[PDB]
Amino acid sequence: MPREIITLQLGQCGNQIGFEFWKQLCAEHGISPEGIVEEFATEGTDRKDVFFYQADDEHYIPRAVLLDLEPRVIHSILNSPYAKLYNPENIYLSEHGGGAGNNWASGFSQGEKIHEDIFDIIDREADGSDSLEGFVLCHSIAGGTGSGLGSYLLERLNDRYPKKLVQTYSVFPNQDEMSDVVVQPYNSLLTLKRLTQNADCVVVLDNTALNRIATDRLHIQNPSFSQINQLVSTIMSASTTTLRYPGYMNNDLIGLIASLIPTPRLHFLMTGYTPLTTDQSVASVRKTTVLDVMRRLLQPKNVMVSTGRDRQTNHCYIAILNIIQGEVDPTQVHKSLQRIRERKLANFIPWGPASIQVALSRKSPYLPSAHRVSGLMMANHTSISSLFERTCRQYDKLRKREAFLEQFRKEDMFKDNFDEMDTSREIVQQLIDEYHAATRPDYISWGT
Amino acid sequence: MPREIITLQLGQCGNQIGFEFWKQLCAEHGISPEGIVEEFATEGTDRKDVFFYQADDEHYIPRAVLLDLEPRVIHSILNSPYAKLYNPENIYLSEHGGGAGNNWASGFSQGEKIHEDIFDIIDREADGSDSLEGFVLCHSIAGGTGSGLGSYLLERLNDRYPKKLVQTYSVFPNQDEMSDVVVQPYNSLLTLKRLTQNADCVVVLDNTALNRIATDRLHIQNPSFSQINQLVSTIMSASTTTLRYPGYMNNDLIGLIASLIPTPRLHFLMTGYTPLTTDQSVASVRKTTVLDVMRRLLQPKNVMVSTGRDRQTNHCYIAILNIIQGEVDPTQVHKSLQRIRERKLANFIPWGPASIQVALSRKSPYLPSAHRVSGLMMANHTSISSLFERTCRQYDKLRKREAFLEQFRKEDMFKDNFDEMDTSREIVQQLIDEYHAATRPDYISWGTQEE
Amino acid sequence: EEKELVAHLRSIKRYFLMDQGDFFVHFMDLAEEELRKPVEDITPPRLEALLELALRMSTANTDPFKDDLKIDLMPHDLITQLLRVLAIETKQEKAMAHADPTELALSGLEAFSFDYIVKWPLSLIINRKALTR
Amino acid sequence: RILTHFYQGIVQQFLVLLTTSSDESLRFLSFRLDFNEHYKAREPRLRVSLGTRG
Prior knowledge:
- By secondary structure, chain A is α/β, with parallel strands linked by helices.
- Chain A is built from 15 helices and 11 strands.
- In chain A, α6 (184-197) links the parallel β6 (165-172) and β7.
- Chain D has helices at residues 2-20, 24-33, 38-42, 44-53.
- At the A-B interface, loops of A face loops of B.
């Protein structure tokens, strides 16, 4: 049986991402907003049971959990056509409806208050899974609900489900923009603490990188939350394509993530997407070759991560996984790898063998694709530390100024001290250094 | 001759359930609201004489008795199209019409007040029944009318028909929900006492489970009594299909339940229905396989009983019977059973041989079925004890506070003491332990003088 | 058309070539415990039931030729089968083919093979040499 | 107890015959008869045959 995945969408940003993801999956699989397979959805080649459950022999219901501490967003979601896609028994809603006020400590306290409800929802969804691998949390690290409640949920899942895998879709705060969320460094610190102690995999979604990509790549002068959510949904779709387009390889999440996490500590993943196109440039289906595809993917303008230009650290890729979707010629893949090696388009770890894995994938048959070939890059690249290093520097800048800490001291999670934030900052600094160390042969002894 | 069955609809909920059941049976068998077989009812393969009597050469009248201590529900039934289904000589109505005031003990006393009329009705129906097997009671256990009248009926059936079986479909109070009726646990306890002492089989219908099923399957946020009644009518139709679609085996209720009740105490059955579909999804005839049927049966979302997640007790199925209706290939049944066993999808009793029974049934030819294949699950599962254990815990919580007991103390059954509640609690404890024991090898000696 | 040569080849790809990777992943995830048993401890009926249950419970149920898929218990372990194959191109092919089955209780993983029933004239394409390869 | 022991012996002999039976349906009937493995738990002879022939 498939390894079912429960999707947890946390806070405003996380819930928007989850909703758009479920919409995109429905569109790709030809699933109606009510969870019933459309008559046109005759291609039974997708593995819905990883991410969706069948309610009947005909109705596929997303294995999606929509979680918010504030009722406004949940009520707005419940007014969409997709209200029937998610199993209502897998939905835990905080009774107080007040949200976390963009406070991680408040989100954690709300999670503690809704702990029973959340774990009841989780168990109810778990019994519906024949071979549940684990839970996937989609949230923002900058808010209160997705950060605080998400951290609480991660802690309780780690304590209660120690044998299940924990993947996260964690939206990280913009590190290049001055965050209006003065406690974002506190929220980010608490989320990094939980990722270090209680998460098994952290997918970093930098809102700064999303805005940068929308401006430079999507030609969006003022990226709306909706446009960012649609880009995120496209990324999630690409990440789930191997579930949605079954094939010979990478048919399971553990197979997908094994190449990205060489050691249990090296569990911080960076993402890449291809082809990156501006909304206006859909018109010309470019006959991109695997070499051409990878070359455009190797361009930072097409990279879904905005890493700062670190001049001091010779950042390098620790590992690369290329998930390519669409019509792919194996000889073109071979030539692409050859050209990448000849051109040294990727630097690998010096302390062990490392390479770019390439997967060729089919597109969803129910959604007409304007592009013959699409691609996801999963990469471990030390320059991703520069995003983490930039977040750490912003944290240190607030902590050194004690800015907005009185509001956290008002909350019980932060009432007595901010030691969790300082330990998180130190751990994130060590993470940045290790990512830089992972470019060096001495990474074998890094952190010893 | 068929084993005639008298259908007893008790109290507001029971009478509504009985009325909707008779409507559904009439529609499935092509019986008019006047008791005449509809022209579409050309499949003379149904055994009407089990549940219906013939009024004339053409008209089959249901062998159904609607009994209530409150006149409102009976009057609403008599204003329905099904007023002509029941023999009026088999109808005994309490003259006071006042109900039990939501008191089970009051309902029992009201049954005692109409005892003579009720037993006269029972005797008249028995004489109208060629081979009356027994009575099927539809009632609620939480109220006064359906619960008290059910207890009275159980006592009087045990006294008058001690050699006949009495099965009930008894709607049990939600044991996981705190009843706002502080004496609801007392009424339920008195009803459980009477079911332990005077009933032979109680089908427990937990209103919490009914609401949950309406919510998950009918998408009803607040399940109405009508939605629960329509689910019950579908269940009754499925339970009567083997009477309406005769075959080689299990063509009668007694044949169906004989395999299900291993010991007199182990008479607590769990039910399942499949496929559960929303009315809108009739369009796509899914080629559901016997394996697909069995797989859907194993889903808790399709079980008509909301048992709590007991983490401490390894509740298990004692036995499972799947009644499947529609086109079934025997080789598909065999492969399905093989796969179910291989996958260990069900835990069976440890003290004796146990398996998932599978029944293949025809659909009614007179009723167009939107589904090629339908299925009922009958199961003995120890988690059903959790409903009984939860009811016992709720009773003890109410009894320890004597809350709202003064209304029951007005009635003779509860006037002097609440011993019926304590006996119900002890019986439910023994039932819970036996269901837990039935997962264990020591179930062989559970309840043996050597629960 | 009548022998559906292309359809037979596509079926072989789906099943013999493990093209339906999710089906095989699910089947192996469910069956590993049984394949972990010693060859003498494997219940052939249990393996067959697990095979049919994975076939029907996976998307392999959507394969129109899924019923042509049979379970084959290799007379040699995967290591012994490998040794036989390595001998196939060597004069040892007869010696490894005639090599007694390894007394080591092969795991079900090592004994696992598929069979495919090909009727004449479609059996002309999936020949015993072709089937063995 | 005596009747049960006789029944278990007869069931064991029936299972032996089924394992020696050519009919697959009889083997499937035997497999159904011990779904809870009550006789297999109670009759050692039923435990040995499946371990030895497989």
